[PDB]
């Protein structure tokens, strides 16, 4: 059996500015097996209305998914993602950087 | 469209 | 330009919770247009692109029956491979199937592919001639002999060379207003000083389709730069893609650095500075 650790990118659909609606994306890719736990966090708190794309995979058979939700970025608010996979020793947190 | 019949392994 | 019709099938056995989970998705180029998920009472094939919502019940009933039959076959295949490798029923395993056809610039058949994977590794591969298979071990050689018994390579070659090509033409016509539309990237450079002596220049490419793109930083108009941070191309969520490239430059010399963007939607490469 072959397993692969997931690659994670957190970003917005559009260039973020305060007070303007947007979409917060968590892109997970390159992982195997398909079972994966992805969460989106607002100040460490789990966001409820989160949707994701249909399961697909690349030529190397590693899967990828897009988790997303609608949000409005502000100055005080921190946004991150929690990713848990069988390959990880612990859940991985990736904060959202609006410059990335 | 999908293939009509999937192969058997 | 070339176009492709691709399907991706994933089957995952569930040790103590019933039948395996089965998911199938179809792509035209970089656009997903259908999905099937067997995690329902009577699962069905549904549209995932707006231009697919014009299909009548004849199409969706047929694709639903085909997808349901594939899920049953893969459940059988998962049981067979478990016996090949003498694996316990208490363990979860994954069977993957990918196939597709590509058209040439003239719109005719260019090539086709079909591939199986078990637990994340190649298992059985349809060779480039579409007339023979490649097995990874003695277990897959049994699958190969079974495939030979059924003339499976001929049946799949007929699908890839005829059925796949005919229906890709149908999909390209139905979704022509978006599938045949190149979207150029909207580009700009951001500046992030790291210290008094250095700063980061990040070259952005936003909202482009298809996903193939090249971002390169050039110094003094001379080829390549040494230390470029490149992120994998990522979906924006609206059908278009994103990417950026960053380089650390001495403060005051930022005018020496130029970002070059190559993309099918650009008649000529785009050059930008901060």
Numbering used by the authors:
A (entry chain D): 1 to 100
B (entry chain Q): 1 to 9
C (entry chain C): 1 to 274
What does the paper say about this structure?
Human leucocyte antigen E (HLA-E) is a non-classical MHC class Ib molecule homologous to H-2 Qa-1 in mice and Mamu-E in rhesus macaques (RM). HLA-E exhibits preferential binding to a highly conserved set of nonameric signal (VL9) peptides derived from the leader sequence of HLA-A, B, C or G molecules. VL9 peptide-bound HLA-E complexes engage the natural killer (NK) cell inhibitory receptor, CD94-NKG2A, thereby protecting healthy cells from NK cell-mediated lysis. Whilst VL9 peptide binding and NK cell regulation are ostensibly its primary function, HLA-E, and its rhesus and murine homologues, can present peptides from microbial and autologous sources to CD8+ T cells.
